[model samples]
Target chain A: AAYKLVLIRHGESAWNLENRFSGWYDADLSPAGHEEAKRGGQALRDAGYEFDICFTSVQKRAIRTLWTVLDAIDQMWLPVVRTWRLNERHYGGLTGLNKAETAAKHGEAQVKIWRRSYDVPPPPMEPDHPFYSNISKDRRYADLTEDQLPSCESLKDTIARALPFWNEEIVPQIKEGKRVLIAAHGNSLRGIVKHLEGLSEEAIMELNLPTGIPIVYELDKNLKPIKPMQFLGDE
Target chain B: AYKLVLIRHGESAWNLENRFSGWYDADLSPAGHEEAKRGGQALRDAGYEFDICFTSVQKRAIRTLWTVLDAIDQMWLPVVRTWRLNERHYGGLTGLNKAETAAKHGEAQVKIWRRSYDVPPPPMEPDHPFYSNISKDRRYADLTEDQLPSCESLKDTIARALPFWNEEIVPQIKEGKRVLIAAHGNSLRGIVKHLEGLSEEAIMELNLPTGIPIVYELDKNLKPIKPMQFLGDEETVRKA
Candidate 1:
């Protein structure tokens, strides 16, 4: 049997429902998000999938999503590893700003470039930005070196940061024949999918992952994808 | 200065049923969840902060920790889980209601089994009808056959659990990280016994209530700077 890797983007967070940029501001999941996690777990359980280990971001939304899924699957005892590398892309000064309001202020074209561009980052968050306190004073990231912390990250930067974690932590687990589940954020998972599918930068920009869906990739011994990754329980 | 906080899981389903729950993997009841949330709120109200957390592998403890983290707004702290922190194994008494066990075994015998430091209840039969098959569970796969307890005395629990405190938790506290441990009554008592240097007799009389955080402030030597304090009102703390 081929090794299976399951990827799930965390369900809608409070900020997601508010149409705000979450970034690493640590917004929690909404009630709908909790339901989505439970359903995602149910779909995986119905498919008879079992995992040996799990991974998630340091954010509560992703962590709680993984908790709900594992609780539904009756596998809460599985070892869960959390890392900041799996966190959503840093939204910079745009964080905590309503997306529509940002578009109204900056115009749609520039907003789209900041959001979807592979290489161009938004303006660096000023220390006085409302969301800056989350990074400036939050103890969770206190251990991270100043250079490791990001003010804002383009997709290219996110990929650059996240790929090392994949090569180091995730690949070895896959090679060891452990079934792994990752509950992470949008761009973090997109970075992973882009690498695994060998998608071009242009092609990657077109990818938009639906929340709480379990996407399974069956990989060969060398960790190459053996078949197209399938979305479980979807038509 | 470093602080070590210990909390037992709120009432489990088995705890509510008055059954012995050791290693049964039972979950928290609805009231249990409320208790946990209240405890979390109390911790928050007291303005306590934690850097890293620890919990027993059992779901009740893990879930309790989760609720606490959610309340304290520090859900992303690193968590370490270890089976060594599990409840003292109840042996053949597992799954049996306490009242029924006392009636059958005589109250004194049950009392000794429950309270004595060194005395363990009878070893659970591997083929017992009521007890869940511990060996078959994947969570305990890392443990060797000898390491998996069919029964445990309080002494046994302390022996099993203390090494984790010394090796994993001590280093973090030494580095000035606030450490929070969520576990079972006996397991938390085991750590408490070690920390306070309680005698066997002293430990046997020590009773811990569910869903209350016990805060221990330690000096440079990790010895308590003051008597251990529970985070609720004095009346409530006394009753526990």
Candidate 2:
């Protein structure tokens, strides 16, 4: 069997407290989030986990979470790959909207559909939104074609984008006996669970990941899970 | 011109206490952390940005890189760590306090050991604590026995560091990625020597100021275009 793979959703973001949909908004981790990330990292440290190489999204919250974890484990020297492929699903029109404001505008049931639905994406981000004018102009995203840039992303869309990187980069390393830790976001991680566990679309829609808890996946040589996913911090 | 930034790691705990750090993994001092932040801020103020970062496996250097990235608002940048970029191995003098060592060994002998281009200190003994850790440290797991140093002259350090610069770093620079290497004094000196075509004696005396970004403007052939300049002011340079 290959080494166990670990996935940690980033700790609580300022948006997590402000009750805003962050998506690609790039939130700062709240004070609570900082400790939560350290606790998660310390939990892994206690378990004697030593990673060979790590992967993280380009977003600060996730990047810092990976940094926090590596610092806890005294492994800042480990190689880390930062990729936009692991960025949270783009929230589109709801990118920075507060839940109360959104619920007032759209019915709560409809809001939940956009929140939990497998295929239903929020409306495209407005033309004057930062993504259209400012954020999209970032050098980090210089490689994406106009069509590749997401106006909106459903869980399905996120899975479509994340799977290729997982299959191409992560799978080969795990198969070659690399211990991998992925510090990423909620929906993007949901996409991976859906792919790895072969969860039905309906089932995945109801799934929610607890922040800062590491999900451990044990897999065979062909990359099939040998057992169910287990969150390490809970134990 | 191709862009590259080199930084000697901020003062380590050992540095403030006037000790020889060598291969020992030392954390940053409190002032060192602030210095790193200021260095990063100066770069940000100058509108300099980086696509990638390179650093040594040593904690002081890596943490300096981390603080600089955070200060520059580019915490997401890709960082590559290599042991080859570590400080000059101090050999048998690995963790000795400099003043204390100077008192024990004649100052002239110590000077020759430190500032000489080719003179190495005595090799570390078998009982050295840091030496034992280096033998078993997981970070250095990739190194074979020969690659691990007992003692190294400045010439030996330059020999070790240049291969990585030529092989790993040169291609990335040629690819047009803006680069920052947060590293140690001697390892960075090796790169500067190769880049500017400085004589061995000139490089021997070229003490890199810590916690400052040294911007190197390189011609198409990767040779220096002009004299190197520090991003921060003389005040901060003197503080380091």
Candidate 3:
């Protein structure tokens, strides 16, 4: 069996508890979310899945969850690579707005269509939207070549962006006998799982994995995980 | 009346006390040096002086002083315009290979000659080997831009530094704000002695480690009513 790779969703955020759309918004983890992240780590330690290196999104929820997991594994000092590639799928005009309020204002079925659509983007946010362009010129965003980026993404759109990173960066590193772990956003991880398992786009859009469970993919010499996916803490 | 300022240096090679340093340019004592560095945060927190900074030409003594000064508040503190105000000049074969000197001159004697005020260990002659290269050294050329050649005794320093004080520093004191000086052990003492009237022997006995800031308050005459005090949490200073 090839070395195993795992992808974990970060725990709930303040927005998650509030039932708001946090896509691309940097919401911090709630206290319960933190505990869940810790439990995820303790479960990993008890199961003994050591990691050589790990990746996380630049978002705070993902980073904090990774902190909890690493602290559990006693690997707080392990090198980490952070990127926006694994950030939560951007929700565009619907970001930061409450889901209930948006449904009240835009109608329930229309809101559902926007949220669950595989390809239909909710509505484009302004380049100056407080949700996305707040720190547009910051050095951290220097690499975002576009003058402005989309504020929202569909599950399909998320896959397009995340797969390139998985194929170009994550896979080769794992193939080199390096044990790679990815700590990421909910939709982002779903995109990777969909691509790795070759799920139908519609099927991928419906899957919402819980946060902090390390779903392991044991790849073969060709880099396909023989075990489709195994959750770390699950028996 | 410029605003009062203080500086402590960063980690120095000697602060580790790994080697012998004299006027020969040993750096700060490690723990002593670190005290000021840590203090820099507090000064920054408290909004310590943000004005023209000062130091000596020698590395060890001024490095810590500069780091603390920089650590406070605005990182915009000008690139320390230093003066050879407190230069610790190495006497008697400047840069005398420490080990060989200990063997030939004996450690205790070297220590006394180095430490004593009246003794004034053999001087580095103006035209001698070390002087020619040291005289035009770049580190000093900028700050001492107005002063003359290398090497100093604590006594020798007061003489050179005091005039600069009256002409350059005193006017700023008259302006009604604070004037901060991040300088060398002896150079600070030189200014201290001039302000406090410490006996030459007493000034000789004082040793300011690298990175520690010595402060002084002056009357209209530029003479201090109270001697300068180092600014830092006492416990933190103790750590340095």
Candidate 4:
């Protein structure tokens, strides 16, 4: 069956501007982030995109961005489902501290390798650390055990969470010919894009999804991309 | 107990008029009759009148009074109801056929007889066109041989009316409480005559119209201590 899937990342957040790694921590979008979300919605609406259902990460930024998009489309009443599996790669102990400080302390090359590496996690935050402890209260990550959860996550760990939800919930609807909109974070979108495009880890690392941009996927009978994906808001 | 009583009759077709209707009952003026009920509500809000009520036999006039009283808190008033209390029967011409009556009997003559306190038109016979043939009118069933108005002059109405006041109305007042009478102009004048003991000529000049609750405060011996008074707003009465 043919399917149209649009993946959007939430816009600039306070932590995003601060160069801090923000994972499951709840942080509101910055004013620039709000503008981006609104621009994305207007861009889709101008292009005549109307979705049947919307999906978003359970994180506040994703949820808020989805709300803004639907408001722009005047479709706030449309059904929405939230899943934690679609979230940013956990930033671990680097969550609250400035990224430059971490690089300075840990050495730039080691930090760069940690950031760019697919399988390696930077460092796991202690459960007592504010970031790791914060997720226990968050509805999205509260169900995961300390080991299952991450103060920080590698790309592989992010995929472990997100891929399951895609298989269980999202793919079924795409098969039914319903248009789907997903508002998520940066790394999570990469994971989804990797799956949708059948890209290898090396190839997926090259795809940097700009925040708040909607990437539209047109799939063939088996949900493989039939056409090249289009990036929205670039125009 | 001091009870503020209000009684309004069910509406009639003519009460809607700005016309003068005294002993001549043309039924409640429709609009006026409706307001009569609502106006009665003011009394209801104040409190119940712990007194018996008296009402006439003419349905419109009595019903108008009933509507007002019903709107009041005192719907349970053990009314000492009466027919002699009906609208002053317009004698030979009971029902005003409007144009026909005005054409047959000159309007001036009809007006004079209708308005004149002592004068009553020719009496209606038992077989007359307008005679009420109903037998269940308990009001008239026990009427004394001579008191029945086959036709009645205004003076004759007072004579017949005074006995009911002494027998039925005075006993309640003597018991040191208020009493309400819902009756026609002529009939109320009859009681007013004895209460104030006005001269026959003075009583002859009296006219009681519909919807005016005439209040009389009485002395220890049941004599009117205060002058007869009407209960309603001056603005409302002006419109009335």
Candidate 5:
């Protein structure tokens, strides 16, 4: 059986336009991001990609991006599953900081390490931090066990939470020959791609996913990639 | 321990044009979009959260639900789409302007077709311009031939919509899940009539405005504990 999967990073967010660190902070898509999402869906339609189900992060940007895409493709009825595991990596103390200003305050080299280092995380947010105060009190996360919540998360830490969802929910569906689409955040998609391509820690660091693009993967019976993942309309 | 939230879809393009839109798939007007966001904001402001949501297969209802979910920051909630939640079929009058129809048929006839519980407008001919043949649409492919309709009275709509409430929605509500229903004006009124045990004459008097959430608290038996209310207004509840 041939299995197909498509992964999409959510479109440019309000914070993305502001050039601030979004992390687990929820932001809606910018206006341009809405257009990009529609174009992305049109690209999928042109390629004849039909999905049986959809997956998304609990965040609004990802969910709304998926909504616009599905609306463009006329497939808004597909069942969608939203999970916190698909959320962006927690940026901790850097959550709401402006990128250029943060770079000015800290050396660019140190800031780059916090942004790109595989195992290194930004300073953990304290309970007293304004950002942490809001997140800690959000009722949406009320069901989570205390340990399940993260104040700061490295890319490695992101994978530890995300991979299980792949193994448990995604792998089984693909094995059953269902075509799937996942709309999520940058680090969330990166975590999945790192696992799918078996990229080395160093190699994964070089992979940057552009927003509002559909990346398609076709797999064999064993679910190994038959060819390199293709980004639809990339040409 | 149980709550039911009902929202009529925001104003449709047809609603803005003052046309009779019953099952003719038109989308929300720009003002309708803002109304939906306002309804969602009201829900959020009132601290209403839900486990599951239901909307009609129609675009207006579905889009309204999307905006509402977005405003409330609950896009993650599971959604169920069913044709049973559609607006009452307006039959031969489907695409005509409401004022024009009133002029053509006279006020009394139009009022009977519009408000009478059991009076339906003339059935659309198979070749009518607005007849949206169900057999051709994949969304309704599961239905048998007789289940599809050419036109419907309010009673007919109640017959079709009531089963969904009894079978699908009630079991979940009984399980203590907060339920949200985003549907059309007539369909929502039908559900309210059934739940409140309103007489046919009493149901005819109830008018639901677009994009407002009416919340109901029910006991274990699923009967309302008090009068139902609109999210942001006590005056609306008093009027109801």
Candidate 6:
């Protein structure tokens, strides 16, 4: 085996229950989210998988997801490296607004475009907006330059920021023969998934990442997939 | 000013039951869990916040630190684990009920083996009764053959423990990370010995309480500037 990697998209967030756009929201894992993460960890352990190092977003949802998964697998001692690079795409002007509100405000067709099109981002969030204001003060982003912080991001923008980390931090460890598990948000996983599977923008836009399901990828010596990435549970 | 905090894990299942459990990896009991949670509560109440943490790979200590970090709502804090911080290995006597061992070996002989600085207990063989305990642990997979101990004296324990302190943890302290270490009683004794130049009698007599955060103030040289302080007395466990 060249290398094996695992990616777990975190389960539901508190904002998810409200049907709100929660990218970069740092929302807590709702009860369902908690259970889903635990189940994901149990499935991984039962499959006899072990991780040498884990990566996660600094957001509570993903970090807590990684923690729950680690606890479930009895691998609580695993080194977890947290990075903002794995954060969900910034939902910008659409953040904190429920899906119904956004549809009512901007019309369903426009909202669908924002949701489905990989290139279109919602209007930039104002610096004074509460969401951006809260993030400005968050210590996790304190080291980021003003430009480094996202005011808004299309799916492509998120990929650009995340792939550098995928190359620098994540890939090197995998090359050194350390098994890796990355517990991250929907959009960040989409970026890596998009890269790995060589999905067309249209294909990726249609792809769905089920929450708390473990995705396993096996690569050849050249780091090309020998087969499609497999979802571990329910298959 | 350099500041550091170190804690001995709460009473392990074996500890509460009086077993010679060093290196056998006994988990914490319910009381031990509560003590760990209280340990966190006390640290938070005292306004202590840490950027990073260190612990042994053993669950008792790792769980203690995890509970403490959770109580403080700093679950995002990075944790580093190493077997170097593990409890002194008990070798042949491992898994033996402490009372039975005392009864069998005689208390006086046990004390010298248990309490003496340089003298080790009888070594554990590859076919030891407790051999299976350490044989399969993935946590020790990184340890070289010599690093895996069959038995260790308190001096041997400190010998293993101090290198990790000066080499790894001290550099982090120097880099200005507010550090907390959740470790074993003996492993922590080595830390106490290093930071303050403890004599044999002082080191031997010193018994730190379980699941309490011990805070130290260090000078420019990283030596203790004042007496170490415990944030919680026994009374706080009217809760965590």
Best by lDDT: 1
Residue A119, model 2: lDDT of 89
Ranking by TM-score: 1, 2, 6, 5, 3, 4
- Name the better of 2 and 5 by TM-score: 2
Worst 10 residues of 6 chain A by lDDT: A133-142
Which candidate do you rate higher for TM-score, 1 or 2?
Answer: 1
| Regions of model 4 farther than 4 Å from truth | A145-147, B1-240
Candidate 3 true-interface contact recovery: 0.00
Please write out the lDDT profile of model 6 over residues B1-240, one tens digit for every residue: 898999888878846325668787677898999989988999888888787888998888888987898788777677788888988887777777777778867999897886688988778777776786686677788888888888888899999999999999998898888999999988999999999999877998888878888889998789899998887855753233
The most accurate candidate by TM-score is 1
Candidate ordering by DockQ (highest first): 2, 1, 6, 5, 3, 4
Give lDDT tens digits, candidate 6, residues A82-128.
Answer: 88899999888888888888899889899988877788887788977
DockQ each candidate and list the results. Answer: 0.70, 0.83, 0.02, 0.00, 0.38, 0.57
CA lDDT of each prediction against the hidden true structure: 0.87, 0.86, 0.66, 0.68, 0.84, 0.85
User: Interface RMSD, all models, one decimal each?
Assistant: 1.0, 0.8, 15.0, 32.4, 1.9, 1.6
In model 3, where do residues sit more than 4 Å from their true spots? Answer: A135-139, B1-240
Docking class for candidate 3? incorrect
Residues A144-224, candidate 5: write the lDDT tens digits: 898998999999999889999989998888887678999998889988888887899998888899889898888888777
lDDT ranking from best candidate downward: 1, 2, 6, 5, 4, 3
- Cand. 2: chain B TM-score: 0.93
> What does candidate 6 score on TM?
0.92
What DockQ does candidate 3 score? 0.02
User: Which sections of candidate 6 miss by over 4 Å?
Assistant: B14-17, B237-240
Query: Candidate 2, what DockQ?
Result: 0.83
Candidate 5's DockQ? 0.38
Error of 1 at A78 (Å): 2.1
Residue B162 lDDT in model 3?
Answer: 80
Give the per-residue Cα lDDT of candidate 2 at A207.
85
